[PDB]
Every structure is written in C-alpha cells, then in structure tokens.
Design a protein around this ligand. Sequence first.
Ligand SMILES: *[C@@H]1O[C@H](CO)[C@@H](O)[C@H](O)[C@H]1NC(C)=O
Lengths: 210, 210
Amino acid sequence: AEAGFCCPADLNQTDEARKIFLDFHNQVRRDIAGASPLLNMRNVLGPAKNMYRMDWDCNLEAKAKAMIWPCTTPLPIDTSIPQNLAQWLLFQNSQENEVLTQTPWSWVTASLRNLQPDTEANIYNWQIRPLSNIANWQNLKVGCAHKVCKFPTGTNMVVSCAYGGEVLQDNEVVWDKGPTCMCNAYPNSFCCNNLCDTIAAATLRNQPCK
Amino acid sequence: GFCCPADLNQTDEARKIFLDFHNQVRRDIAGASPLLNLAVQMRNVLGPAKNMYRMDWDCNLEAKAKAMIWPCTTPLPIDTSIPQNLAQWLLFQNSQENEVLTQTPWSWVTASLRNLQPDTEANIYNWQIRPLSNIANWQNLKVGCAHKVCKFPTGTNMVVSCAYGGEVLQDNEVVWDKGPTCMCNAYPNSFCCNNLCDTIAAATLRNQPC
Ligand SMILES: *[C@@H]1O[C@H](CO)[C@@H](O)[C@H](O)[C@H]1NC(C)=O
C-alpha cells in the first residue's frame, strides 16, 4: 500500500512530503519514457527505453537536509554529488504541500527553456542540468529535503534533492532513446504506467520499516 | 494485437473494451475501490483481494462466445457447460455501437450487487451473484467475448456473450481470496500494476507479435 520510507525521525520531514518529491521524479521519468507532455517551449521528450522507477534513499535525504538547513547565503551546497536546488517565494497565504508540489517543476521549466529546437535532450549539457539529474537513466535513488529559510534577502521555501551516483559531465547520455516499456537493462523487469521497474526493487521497497 | 482469426468478425477495439472491463472489475475488487460510479454504498465496494491476477484474451473462448449468440434465435444456444455471461440490451434508435458495448457488461456487476444482502460474503459463490463471480474468479485468467445485434421478434437487442476458462463455479466456492491489494504470490515472477497482479511471463506472452 502506502510507501515505506523508513527514515530516521531526526530528518524531521513527513512521508507525505517525501512522497510528493519521489512521485514528482517518477512522473518526469514516466513522461520522458512515454513521450508525454511534461508541464501543463518544447514540452515533450522521448520516448526512452530502460527508464526505471526511482526509490528513496534516506542517506541522500540527510545530505539534502544538510545543504539547506543553515539557511545561509550562499548555502553549503555539495557540488561533489549530483544535486538540484530550488527556492520558491512564499506569500502570506502560501500552503506548504502546494508549494512542495509546485517547486520541483521549476527544474523542469528551467531546463526545457534552454532547449533549442535542435537540441538532443537526452545528451547532457550544463544548461539542462536539473532535468538531466532527474531523468538520468543511470540513477535510481533520490532523497530531498525542504525548509522555510529566513535569508537576509528574505524568507523562501528551499528544496534540495540529492541523487545517487556521479555528477553528469559534458555530452554524457542522460537517457537512451527507444520504445516506451522496453525494459531489459535489469533482471526480471516489468513496466507499469510507462515506467520500468524490477521485481527485486518492488520486493525491497515493500519491506516493512524496522 | 489480439491475433484472433479474421472470421471472428470483430475488431480489436471491441476486444479491448471487453478485456479492459474485466480487468477494471478485478482491479476494483483487488483494491477495494468502488465498482459503479455511484461511493456511499458499501455494497458497491468489495475487497480487497490478494492474488487477483490480470486476465488475458483467448480467441477460442471468443469463438465459443460468438457461437452462442450468432444465430439470434429464441432461445439462444447458450453453452452452460462452461462458465459464461450473457447480456442483452434493447437498443434505442440513436444508440452507438461501441458506447453500448462499453456500458452493457456493467449490468453483470449491477445485477449481482443488487442481490447482495448487507451481511452477504461477496467472495462466496451463489447463483444470484454468478455474473460478477465469473468476472472476478481468481482461478481463471482467460476470457473471450463476442457481440451481435439480434432482431428478436420481441425487439432488436445488442447481445454480448463472454466465455471464461476453467470450471463452472458451484455453491459456496471461494471466488476470490480476501487479502491485501498487491499481494501477488500465486505464480513466480509476479508483480502488481494499478492494483492488479500480473506475471512477467504473461506480460511477455501478450506482447508477442501475431
Ligand atoms: C521540525 O520542523 C518544523 C518545521 O516544519 C520545526 O518547526 C520544528 O522545530 C522541527 N523540529 C526540530 C527538532 O528541528
């Protein structure tokens, strides 16, 4: 049923928030795999083969929390790992989960904006780094944190996501062009809602918290 | 595609309507979601069920279904020696074919639910809930359906027949197993998608070319 994140209490974030961030990632990955519209400029990418479902990593979440928690200008961002950072203006009437739902899409918007009609979106360049982190077919783990920071420049919502694996470099293949639901990179693969997955990953994510 | 013989004289579009219907009912039961778009009434919400697996088409059952309805006689040559469902709908002058085909199988659900008492165990067979029981039978995964407009002297009807694999259900037989949605362990290499169990073998098989 509901997702087992099983993260330590001291991370001080709700599973509902974790779910928003993780569902966001898989939604982007699924849109690319199925060549479906991303935002409600170029807005359709893919299709892609071997685009697999991401799972949470509580250690990556802790890294993300550490990068934003001091609320300093600038933040102690760890550029030695793949990560995305976003900041969102808060208004009097701002509702937290709406903010958390909307904020990450800014990474998709920023990246798409830099796509020219001729740009190979599946190939990395610095102008599309945030989307590339999200759609990296080689990375299956993510952890994100959020915080209302009172910076000297004013109060904002800050979101950081840290990713498994390596920082992408120039001209790396971010994802592989191919048919939706072609899933053969891993043993015992299946496809659900246009996103590849494996029995091993499903079995692991459904283990009870301990 | 469904790869069924040309002489069955039915489109894959109709086959998908019938197949999707069956798996919609099964997924509602598996996931304890409302069956009819009607969600105050608890007799409209059955389940959850464990080991409810996705159904697949069978061209030979379709042939048996077609044979039961094609002559348009009164009575029809229904073969009660196998599990089957029959639906007849008196057409109106502006009825559209595929719209009726999408609607009429639901009468099997509505008719069975109509016979549930508040304390009735809906996973336990009795003839009053036979049509729903055929659809939701966990021990059968094959279905084949046909449709035809018959000019009976008593009026022109859309007629739909679905034939099912396996045995005719008997009084007090367990139709499906009460248990957690997405617990799928009746077969090796199982997975769950949209609240419905499936296997890698069954996915591979249905995705083969004719
Ligand atoms: C956890 O987060 C809330 C803000 O959402 C904060 O007010 C609270 O003090 C935090 N708890 C700790 C121990 O940091």
